[PDB]
Design an enzyme around this catalytic site. Structure first.
Site, PDB file in Angstrom:
ATOM      1  N   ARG C 290       0.892  -1.155   0.000  1.00  0.00           N
ATOM      2  CA  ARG C 290       0.000   0.000   0.000  1.00  0.00           C
ATOM      3  C   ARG C 290       0.927   1.201   0.000  1.00  0.00           C
ATOM      4  O   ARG C 290       1.305   1.699   1.081  1.00  0.00           O
ATOM      5  CB  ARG C 290      -0.911   0.004   1.276  1.00  0.00           C
ATOM      6  CG  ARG C 290      -1.812  -1.246   1.433  1.00  0.00           C
ATOM      7  CD  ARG C 290      -2.232  -1.421   2.893  1.00  0.00           C
ATOM      8  NE  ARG C 290      -3.222  -2.483   2.913  1.00  0.00           N
ATOM      9  CZ  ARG C 290      -3.827  -2.946   4.039  1.00  0.00           C
ATOM     10  NH1 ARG C 290      -3.736  -2.439   5.258  1.00  0.00           N
ATOM     11  NH2 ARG C 290      -4.664  -3.962   3.968  1.00  0.00           N
ATOM     12  N   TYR C 324      -6.155   2.848   3.238  1.00  0.00           N
ATOM     13  CA  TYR C 324      -7.516   2.751   2.771  1.00  0.00           C
ATOM     14  C   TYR C 324      -7.982   4.048   2.134  1.00  0.00           C
ATOM     15  O   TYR C 324      -7.437   5.106   2.428  1.00  0.00           O
ATOM     16  CB  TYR C 324      -8.337   2.379   3.976  1.00  0.00           C
ATOM     17  CG  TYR C 324      -8.353   0.955   4.506  1.00  0.00           C
ATOM     18  CD1 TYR C 324      -7.412  -0.040   4.238  1.00  0.00           C
ATOM     19  CD2 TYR C 324      -9.477   0.718   5.244  1.00  0.00           C
ATOM     20  CE1 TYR C 324      -7.614  -1.301   4.734  1.00  0.00           C
ATOM     21  CE2 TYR C 324      -9.688  -0.543   5.740  1.00  0.00           C
ATOM     22  CZ  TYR C 324      -8.740  -1.519   5.494  1.00  0.00           C
ATOM     23  OH  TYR C 324      -8.924  -2.811   5.935  1.00  0.00           O
TER      24      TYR C 324
END
Ligand SMILES: *[C@@H]1O[C@H](CO)[C@@H](O[C@@H]2O[C@H](CO)[C@@H](O[C@@H]3O[C@H](CO[C@H]4O[C@H](CO)[C@@H](O)[C@H](O)[C@@H]4O)[C@@H](O)[C@H](O[C@H]4O[C@H](CO)[C@@H](O)[C@H](O)[C@@H]4O[C@H]4O[C@H](CO)[C@@H](O)[C@H](O)[C@@H]4O[C@H]4O[C@H](CO)[C@@H](O)[C@H](O)[C@@H]4O)[C@@H]3O)[C@H](O)[C@H]2NC(C)=O)[C@H](O)[C@H]1NC(C)=O
Ligand SMILES: *[C@@H]1O[C@H](CO)[C@@H](O[C@@H]2O[C@H](CO)[C@@H](O[C@@H]3O[C@H](CO[C@H]4O[C@H](CO)[C@@H](O)[C@H](O)[C@@H]4O)[C@@H](O)[C@H](O[C@H]4O[C@H](CO)[C@@H](O)[C@H](O)[C@@H]4O[C@H]4O[C@H](CO)[C@@H](O)[C@H](O)[C@@H]4O[C@H]4O[C@H](CO)[C@@H](O)[C@H](O)[C@@H]4O)[C@@H]3O)[C@H](O)[C@H]2NC(C)=O)[C@H](O)[C@H]1NC(C)=O
Ligand SMILES: *[C@@H]1O[C@H](CO)[C@@H](O[C@@H]2O[C@H](CO)[C@@H](O[C@@H]3O[C@H](CO[C@H]4O[C@H](CO)[C@@H](O)[C@H](O)[C@@H]4O)[C@@H](O)[C@H](O[C@H]4O[C@H](CO)[C@@H](O)[C@H](O)[C@@H]4O[C@H]4O[C@H](CO)[C@@H](O)[C@H](O)[C@@H]4O[C@H]4O[C@H](CO)[C@@H](O)[C@H](O)[C@@H]4O)[C@@H]3O)[C@H](O)[C@H]2NC(C)=O)[C@H](O)[C@H]1NC(C)=O
Ligand SMILES: *[C@@H]1O[C@H](CO)[C@@H](O[C@@H]2O[C@H](CO)[C@@H](O[C@@H]3O[C@H](CO[C@H]4O[C@H](CO)[C@@H](O)[C@H](O)[C@@H]4O)[C@@H](O)[C@H](O[C@H]4O[C@H](CO)[C@@H](O)[C@H](O)[C@@H]4O[C@H]4O[C@H](CO)[C@@H](O)[C@H](O)[C@@H]4O[C@H]4O[C@H](CO)[C@@H](O)[C@H](O)[C@@H]4O)[C@@H]3O)[C@H](O)[C@H]2NC(C)=O)[C@H](O)[C@H]1NC(C)=O
Ligand SMILES: *[C@@H]1O[C@H](CO)[C@@H](O)[C@H](O)[C@H]1NC(C)=O
Ligand SMILES: *[C@@H]1O[C@H](CO)[C@@H](O)[C@H](O)[C@H]1NC(C)=O
Ligand SMILES: *[C@@H]1O[C@H](CO)[C@@H](O)[C@H](O)[C@H]1NC(C)=O
Ligand SMILES: *[C@@H]1O[C@H](CO)[C@@H](O)[C@H](O)[C@H]1NC(C)=O
Ligand SMILES: *[C@@H]1O[C@H](CO)[C@@H](O)[C@H](O)[C@H]1NC(C)=O
Ligand SMILES: *[C@@H]1O[C@H](CO)[C@@H](O)[C@H](O)[C@H]1NC(C)=O
Ligand SMILES: *[C@@H]1O[C@H](CO)[C@@H](O)[C@H](O)[C@H]1NC(C)=O
Ligand SMILES: *[C@@H]1O[C@H](CO)[C@@H](O)[C@H](O)[C@H]1NC(C)=O
Ligand SMILES: [Ca+2]
Ligand SMILES: [Ca+2]
Ligand SMILES: [Ca+2]
Ligand SMILES: [Ca+2]
Lengths: 388, 388, 388, 388
Positions: C290, C324
């Site tokens: 990520r 996220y």
């Protein structure tokens, strides 16, 4: 939404109950609490709040070194919630300056701060959070005012100011304000020789102020003001129970229109509720330092020059420090009569506790009760040794 | 609830009184205060507030090292209560960006922040706390704006922006906004050679901005704007009293439509109140650094090219640091006339005080008075040595 | 004061401008900021606010050691002002629990937190700050929901929940709530194989959710919901531009109704705006971690199985961490069309930065613009080494 | 804006769901959180809030040493937002004193704090943030009251007070207040031998209080009050499931009108919901210390002297500390029936964890549900070793 009118009379005071206390120096040992002094308490229509003159540092910051000095560019009048500490994050700055007063007239609040050098100081009067009138120094030596709330009746709110020597004759004036604007002013008249720092209240359309003569009286000056006629008079409290500090011991007979001799050139801001047989005087217990604090019932103290106490209540014990004290009331409380209240400033640090470099305080306040309630003492409660 | 209209004229200014001061670097030594610069002051209908561009760190956090740099992704426009410090817990973020302006039109507030790399920056205009219009860079070199409040008249609020070189000809445009939406825009016209950082006010349906030529004038550009016709003109202030910094010494005769030569490629944001005989100029006292600060009364400074001072007032002394300064007024105060006010940024840290690694500031502000009041000086007041 | 109705369509998105950013880990190095993760952004009629699941410790407190774990009794859903940090003193706790969602229906706000052990968890639905409905675990393995806002149309607000394995078939249900009360619920239907963590929006009386298949798709599930008929369908996004992480490299042809194979049993919450030619996909830049973040314009991504990008915008660079991301909009903004917005969570700490013991994050958010504005990147900005 | 009337009956309780929890000692390890004890929870018409008696120090300040002592001049009743910590900066002081109670009557809130020395204490009753009635000590040994909310019906709000020995017969009175003013009062009547610390609720125009006999019962006293007739009665809970602490093990048969013998002169504040078959008792799990906590369903516990549990729910596990617990309800929630709720105080520090010098606590609270939901345990969660 219309101006308050001093309509009621005072309730009977048979004892005093705790109203607010903030425990500021305790909690300041480990919270971000500002260094203050010269506190007082004032009420709005919807909330009563605590007030003081900030020193522009927190108690544990390094800039707290040197806060025994009274006037500087870093001080401001701040207010905060009843019984919380003057925190950096919870305080509201009212105006900039090293001397103040403030009262609500029913519609909105007037504040007056003073700043300047000693020979060129100036007051600006704030009404509804905006600057409206400014006044400049008239006698060119530390222009100052009450250090506790003023009192308003139908728009007019009088303030006492002194400009000149603190050790000889000075120039005192009573200004009548309405909505920020000077209506008139007068010089001091009557028999008081020296006025400094008035603590006032009103009942039945009259304002009473108990002030401090610094020059030569250990008994206290009183100014009675009429807000409608806009006139005033002055006397000293007749009673031999002497309530300034330092002071000589209590005599047998007192003085009604002359200073009681014995200590010159020093004092403390104090107050009293002067209501016939229902009269109560506040004073330090030490005659020599600001330490200890008591309330004393002395019937007709103002007029009778031989009046002795009839009942008492210890507020702070003599082994603990006190300081300035004054009068306020919640003129917007429901009821047949004004309930009388006061605060006592509790100074910690220099000059008496010389092992730290700062000076600061906490507040204790009390209101009256018609019950004869039991008493406790209310000391600051910090231990200076934790700050070392 | 209906748009403000610049109806009144300015009151007469016979001296300046303190309005707000926050003592931010003192209190930041031991409180959680954010590192800022480029402050200003703006008023709503119900409260006036302090503003600045945050650096995204507190003064004592480690990330304060390096805050001499002007533009980065961690800066934001924040506002806080009048005369409190920019605290982490009491501040309100208006928009993200390293250059700004903001004004209230009577109904609600417009804010404009700018962010980007130097060759691809962009402004987004916020009205009623929501993003509405965005503008992109036109000349692809640091798109910037006023760094102090804009002024609105019946919905239209003009903003000056510069995009291009700071050391040669640039592209400046005046945009007219209403409720967030571009009505029209024009390029700069008149005789000013270079505009950077305008400080503006209005009276009798006219907006006046005193700006900074960075390229070559030590005398200042002025833009007069008409919000109804939406047109503008530019000149330089004629007076020989030179108010940019650094600057050559004051001449005898001044220049009305050309830059006064002597120092190239550097300056400071400054302002002035230009009102006939009632004209007051602000400037640094050092001709060489941003240090000291004074207000000077110079009748007809804009038009007369030989106008000398008539009265003065020292705001900060020459041994203390100053920085940027600008104009605001409380257009929603009761009264016959607009009272003029200004702020001065007081920078502490790098580059002059190289022994710490951060740069930050405090605010002092003042408004006018018709009384001739006495003066005091208002320095930041922190001791850098406590931060070591 | 009457329920919002999804009336408008989306504006055209030609670039993205910064909307909010809080710089929480920078400022938390020296302020009392709480350790969070799983942030999102939701709007009321009068203010948009930031949200996250608290860990019950400040970043510098000792209890921050161990905050990589997801579920415990000390976590709660909290909200705070737009673009401020989650501070101990400025945050508002909405409900207790380690998974959530929340939306305003126009009249007031519904919140749902979930707590429990893994095999006996439970959701309670709060409407107007009070507990109203509770739901218990149906498949007895970590009952969870969206981790970003739900969307309401005339009182009905659907929420997607999954209960069961995260590594095989699970049980997903869509519940329709109105004023806190379950109207109906259905099991997942259509071709999506596994749903986890939906990010939703609405336009013209339809709700679109882009979700995460954890089991086996590197392309993303989409659920289209009808709030009037209370029905739904599911597909995968057809486009070969793969937006889950970790993921195999982009193919040539994509899959419309089957998972794209290549990485099993792992993912990240993500989103997209699916609006014909006006379609924009968000994704991490690393296919393996990520890290990095970009917006890509891919016309008709949902339906065309060979659609490639047409325009892009880098939001976070690949050398910086992301996490996220999700969708929100300010359905109460003035205008002809809904402006699309998103946030990206920026995780700092374990597991990638193993030299500290905590995990926390900051937020960056963006909204769309019809202008083609220039881009900058928006990294967290803390230096981990200051925390050692 | 008109007085609340206890109109509804209680909903059926089939399990308990989490309502609030603040994680105060965790977060206090590194935030400015005040040292408290004796917490409870009370609701206004628009918000429910947490309450406790402050000790006047933060957990990490030096003055936290010695906070095992119960009464002193530095304690005050404070309230704060639901599920936040008692912070210095977010707390509101209600009144000064080391024992309290507080309830809202629908129009506004009454608060009662008590302070004094042991032989001369006094209660003052605050209504609408102002002092109205004061009561002085009648039996001259630690005048105390409930330590949890009172309950009002159409203006009348009864409060139970005990003055006298805690180890022998005492003097208990039930006072009926309306808008701050004493309407009437009675001495305790019925079969209860000793009352200390009542926890109360109401349904269908009746108030039920479960109290603590300190002298000699390990089963609990119950007072039923009629607010219209202003009368009361007392019994003990019949059930053999004993819910005081310390306590002997559960017998087979219980006592309805006599103390159950086995442990003398010690106890804990506790509660119960007494509603026929729908009756639920709270108790510590250790019979010897305040540790662990459980809810037990015991049908007709009050009347049947052989009633055993039918269903249970563990709230705190036996290896973790608990403390006082009480009842509240949100009488202003929408619905057919009152939902029952409670809090449990979780004490940390001296006397059981002697390696620190302070005592403080956190709160956990729960409300009922008609669903049979799954359970988790809710411990304080701090590690004492981080405070060393
Ligand atoms: C429970 O609670 C209740 C409620 O608080 C407690 O009851 C109260 O108790 C108080 C303390 O006993 C009491 O306060 C005193 O009241 C006296 C009034 O009493 C006289 O009248 C009544 C009725 O007529 C009679 O019953 C009684 O016999 C007396 O005649 C005051 O006189 C007291 O004040 C004086 O004493 C204190 C020290 O004890 C001094 O500090 C104070 O300054 C007063 O004395 C000085 O000043 C006077 C006046 O000039 C001098 O004459 C005297 O010599 C002192 O002078 C020196 O000191 C001062 C200060 O240092 C200095 O300036 C000066 O130069 C001299 O050096 C006192 O105020 C309350 O009335 C009583 N309340 C009620 C309703 O009962 C109860 O005790 C509590 N306790 C328990 C255990 O239950
Ligand atoms: C109590 O409070 C009151 C209220 O504050 C105090 O009274 C005020 O006192 C102020 C200080 O004295 C005074 O301010 C000055 O006013 C002058 C105006 O006076 C002239 O007119 C009046 C009436 O006509 C006459 O009475 C008087 O005789 C004068 O003719 C200004 O001229 C003063 O400003 C200049 O002086 C200061 C230094 O003193 C400079 O810093 C300032 O920049 C001005 O001088 C520079 O610039 C001029 C203009 O070009 C040059 O000509 C000059 O040579 C200087 O130039 C050099 O320096 C600048 C800056 O470094 C540089 O750029 C340049 O190149 C050169 O190097 C001053 O402003 C107030 O008017 C007065 N207010 C009132 C109502 O009275 C009172 O004192 C207080 N105190 C006490 C003890 O009670
Ligand atoms: C000033 O501001 C403006 C505004 O921001 C700046 O202008 C923007 O500049 C952006 C960067 O150049 C640009 O963004 C790109 O747009 C491309 C669209 O261009 C194509 O169409 C236009 C018009 O038709 C043509 O002009 C152009 O020639 C092209 O044909 C996108 O294609 C770009 O995205 C791809 O590139 C980046 C890296 O550069 C990748 O990270 C990204 O993921 C895309 O590429 C991967 O994926 C595709 C799709 O499957 C693959 O084909 C490709 O090989 C890559 O695949 C690998 O990598 C991914 C990720 O690691 C992995 O998953 C996969 O497996 C493979 O390993 C890019 O988005 C804006 O459009 C432009 N905006 C405008 C309005 O102009 C301007 O530059 C600023 N600067 C200055 C100095 O003024
Ligand atoms: C998922 O979530 C659900 C929801 O929570 C979980 O299901 C719950 O599980 C709970 C734990 O099993 C259960 O709670 C118990 O309920 C018992 C009721 O059961 C009886 O009736 C039912 C129906 O009639 C029957 O099915 C069943 O067979 C039984 O007959 C209570 O009896 C239990 O309480 C007693 O046990 C605990 C310890 O286990 C004690 O702490 C407690 O104090 C009770 O026992 C003491 O007191 C009694 C009464 O006097 C004595 O008889 C006994 O000997 C004990 O006495 C000693 O100890 C006390 C305290 O130390 C001391 O004072 C005394 O002196 C003695 O020393 C218990 O409350 C829930 O009912 C159940 N809920 C539902 C709806 O099912 C589920 O398990 C979760 N888990 C999973 C994995 O999915
Ligand atoms: C005070 O008196 C004035 C008339 O003197 C009246 O108008 C005003 O309303 C009175 N104040 C209040 C609070 O009623
Ligand atoms: C305070 O200042 C004095 C001189 O003003 C200095 O000697 C002293 O050490 C300072 N106190 C502390 C604790 O720093
Ligand atoms: C300003 O002028 C407009 C007309 O130009 C008028 O509608 C508006 O109400 C005026 N502003 C105020 C504050 O009255
Ligand atoms: C600040 O950063 C510089 C390099 O940018 C480093 O040498 C310096 O020591 C840092 N200052 C402090 C006090 O950490
Ligand atoms: C939404 O639609 C309903 C009818 O479906 C209507 O009553 C409501 O007022 C509409 N919403 C708004 C914000 O007007
Ligand atoms: C965190 O906890 C681990 C074990 O869980 C311990 O070894 C470690 O040293 C702790 N970290 C710090 C910095 O205290
Ligand atoms: C409670 O009952 C009284 C009459 O006893 C009534 O006036 C009052 O309005 C009722 N309360 C409410 C909330 O309606
Ligand atoms: C707390 O006070 C005691 C005596 O009251 C003292 O011995 C002890 O060391 C103090 N504790 C700490 C940690 O300072
Ligand atoms: Ca004196
Ligand atoms: Ca220049
Ligand atoms: Ca996946
Ligand atoms: Ca007992």
């Amino acid at each position: 939404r219309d101006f308050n009118n001093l309509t009621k009379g005072l309730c009977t005071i048979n004892s005093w109950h705790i109203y607010g206390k903030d425990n500021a120096v305790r909690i300041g040992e480990d919270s971000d609490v500002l260094v203050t002094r010269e506190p007082y308490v004032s009420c709005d229509p919807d909330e009563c709040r605590f007030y003081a003159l900030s020193q522009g540092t927190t108690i544990r910051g390094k800039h707290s070194n040197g806060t025994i000095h009274d006037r500087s560019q870093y001080r401001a009048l701040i207010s905060w919630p009843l019984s919380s500490p003057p925190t950096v994050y919870n305080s509201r700055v009212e105006c900039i300056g090293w001397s103040s007063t403030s009262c609500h007239d029913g519609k909105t609040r007037m504040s007056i701060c003073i700043s300047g050098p000693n020979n060129n100081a100036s007051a600006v009067i704030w009404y509804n959070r905006r600057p409206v009138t400014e006044i400049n120094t008239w006698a060119r030596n530390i222009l100052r005012t009450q250090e506790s709330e003023c009192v308003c009746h139908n728009g007019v709110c009088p303030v006492v100011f002194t400009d000149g020597s603190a050790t000889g004759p000075a120039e005192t004036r009573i200004y009548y304000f309405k909505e920020g604007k000077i209506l008139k002013w007068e010089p001091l008249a009557g028999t008081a020789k020296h006025i400094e720092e008035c603590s006032c209240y009103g009942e039945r359309a009259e304002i009473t102020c108990t002030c401090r003569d610094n020059w030569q009286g250990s008994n206290r000056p009183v100014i009675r003001i009429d807000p409608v006629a806009m006139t005033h008079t002055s006397q000293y409290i007749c009673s031999p129970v002497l309530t300034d500090n330092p002071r000589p011991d209590d005599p047998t007979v007192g003085k009604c229109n002359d200073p009681y001799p014995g200590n010159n050139n020093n004092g403390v801001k104090g107050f009293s509720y002067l209501d016939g047989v229902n009269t109560w005087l506040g004073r330090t217990i030490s005659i020599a330092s600001r330490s200890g604090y008591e309330m004393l019932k002395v019937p007709n103290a103002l007029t009778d020059d031989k009046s002795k106490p009839t009942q008492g209540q210890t507020i702070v014990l003599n082994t603990d420090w006190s300081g300035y004290s004054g009068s306020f009331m919640d003129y917007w409380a429901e009821g047949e009569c004004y309930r009388a209240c006061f605060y006592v400033e509790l100074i910690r640090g220099r000059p008496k506790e010389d092992k730290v470099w700062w000076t600061s305080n906490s507040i204790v306040s009390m209101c009256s009760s018609t019950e004869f309630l039991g008493q406790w003492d209310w000391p600051d409660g910090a231990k200076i040794e934790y700050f070392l």
